[PDB]
């Protein structure tokens, strides 16, 4: 990379941490106005999503 106008390098971890900070949360999802009879709900069944 060209960090701070210098030919240098950064750890993989540093980038990953920066990425996760922008991950976002479920609270930003749109709010549906109704529920059908073929909808699917996500949950931890058998210990997995």
């Amino acid at each position: 990379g060209c960090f701070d106008n210098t030919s240098s390098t950064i750890t993989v971890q540093q980038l990953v941490n920066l990425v996760l900070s922008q991950a976002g949360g479920l609270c930003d999802l749109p709010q549906a106005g109704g529920i059908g009879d073929n909808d699917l709900i996500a949950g931890c069944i058998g210990g997995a999503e």
Binding site: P30, A32, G33, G34, I35, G36, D39
Partner: protein, 98 residues
Amino acid sequence: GTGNNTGWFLFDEVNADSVSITGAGTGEFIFRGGIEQTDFSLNAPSKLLVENRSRVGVVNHLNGLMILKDIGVIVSLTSTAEDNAFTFLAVISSSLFD
């Protein structure tokens, strides 16, 4: 248009050969004007609006919310969507009779 989309988009006097929308995005595409017989095909949970056009080519409605408004002429219309909170077809002041 594909993938996840949010917010509102506007096109004005944007002549186009055809338009296609897919994916799981939930944005709002707004069209307006133009002087070409454009096609449409929406299969997504997005919201689609068209208004103030002299013509529109073939139209397909597989999913999403389509609102046809104030169109001079429509070549043909189709619809096979299914009931869900994001789907509804509404037409306003437009004729199929050329």
